[PDB]
Amino acid sequence: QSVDVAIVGGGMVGLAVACGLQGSGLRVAVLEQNAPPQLRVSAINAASEKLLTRLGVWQDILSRRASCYHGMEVWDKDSFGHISFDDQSMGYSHLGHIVENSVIHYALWNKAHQSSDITLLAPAELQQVAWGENETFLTLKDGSMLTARLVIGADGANSWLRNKADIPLTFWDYQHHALVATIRTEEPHDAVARQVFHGEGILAFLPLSDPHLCSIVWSLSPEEAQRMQQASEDEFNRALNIAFDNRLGLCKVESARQVFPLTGRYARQFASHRLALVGDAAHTIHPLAGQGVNLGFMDAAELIAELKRLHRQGKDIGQYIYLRRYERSRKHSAALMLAGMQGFRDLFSGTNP
């Protein structure tokens, strides 16, 4: 019925905000809108690893299933440039982890259930929102009502909330699709993340736990992605090996081949009156470890710090005059990503021993 914070969306990013607030005393509601290696994985960078540790779920993730990488090798299909480095050259214990998204989500979901100030509502789609001066009024599809000082949108692109607040995102078609799959290679990957640049973007081999398995991200024209998805495994395996310059010898696909579109989503606003948005902007694709849930987790970390400060101070956590501090940080950061000025830093990041 009455909460401080209502989080719309119960994905990794929304759960991370909810888990993050625990200890603050804020009453939080999250409203939802033995298995083999899942096909969707992320390259979890050093800043996300720090967040997950602060949240108390990183060790749960490492114990379930996680693949640590220690080296990086990047080159170009048509020209002579290369970047090659390892954790040791920079005083790191490791560069990052390759982790299944469902593993991360599960760890955060369990933690959320164990958090005394979090209420998870599982059938809880929104029907309406009224943006009152002093509080927000949320009506769920069952007609039940909920009041909040602050609404946090963590539901994908947040189209619905952004529409209600009249702060739309700008969508940008990146004209290429990404094919993903699990590939067994002849040579071991040696816990090195590898990527080759080419005319239709990138081809990355992300090392998994099995010394001879990688999960790939292969960007292609939408047409070529479709061809590669529908090809015989022999055609596919040969095309992949050539695209990867035979770097790990023969390749054998070992999973379904899935394709999804690549897009940018750019925000002129990350907040309004009693509204803050996380996880919905998307800028660069490369470096893979600087984006996806890593960007959303950075959104989450910064929102968490700001709300904890405001709440400490007895301030109204929903007022735009304070939320604009979070927004500014997010916009500055988005700009550095789009300007190409953030990629280098994320590429070379890692965790100290």
Q: Which is nearer to a copy of itself, 188 or 320 (CB)?
A: 320
Binding positions for a copy of itself, 90-129, rule CB under 8 A: 90-91, 128
**What is the Cα–Cα distance from 85 to 193, expressed in whole angstroms?**
10
From the list a copy of itself, Cl ion, none, pick the one residue 90 interacts with, judged by a Cβ distance below 5 to 8 Å according to partner type. Answer: a copy of itself
The encoded tokens of residue 70 equal 């220690």
Per CB under 5 A, contacts with Cl ion among 292-321 are 319-321
Phi then psi for residue 279, to 5 deg, are 80, 5
Structure tokens at 304: 């968490």
Q: In this chain, which of 58, 197, 205, 270 binds Cl ion, going by CB under 5 A?
A: 58
Residue 197 contacts which entry, Cl ion, a copy of itself, none (Cβ below 5-8 A, type-dependent): a copy of itself
C-alpha to C-alpha distances, 60 to 111, 134, 158, 228, 337, nearest whole angstrom: 10, 39, 29, 36, 31
Give the sign of the dihedral formed by CA 98, CA 102, CA 103, CA 105: positive
Which ranges constitute the DSSP H helices of 216-347? 222-230, 233-243, 293-312, 320-338, 343-347
42 is in an annotated binding site: yes
293 appears as a binding residue in the annotation: yes
**Site map for a copy of itself, 173-192, x if CB under 8 A?**
xxxx----------------
Residues 65-94 that bind a copy of itself (CB under 8 A): 74, 76, 78-83, 85, 89-91
Q: Which is nearer to a copy of itself, 42 or 115 (CB)?
A: 42
Distance CA 200, CA 230 (A): 19
| Residue pair 45/301 in contact by the 8 Å Cβ criterion | no
Which residues fall in the annotated binding site for FAD? 40-43, 288-294
Residues of this chain that interact with a copy of itself (CB under 8 A) are 74, 76, 78-83, 85, 89-91, 128, 130, 133, 163, 166-168, 170-176, 197, 201-202, 219, 222-223, 226, 262, 264, 266, 268-269, 273, 283-287, 319-321, 324, 331-332, 335-341, 343-345, 347-349
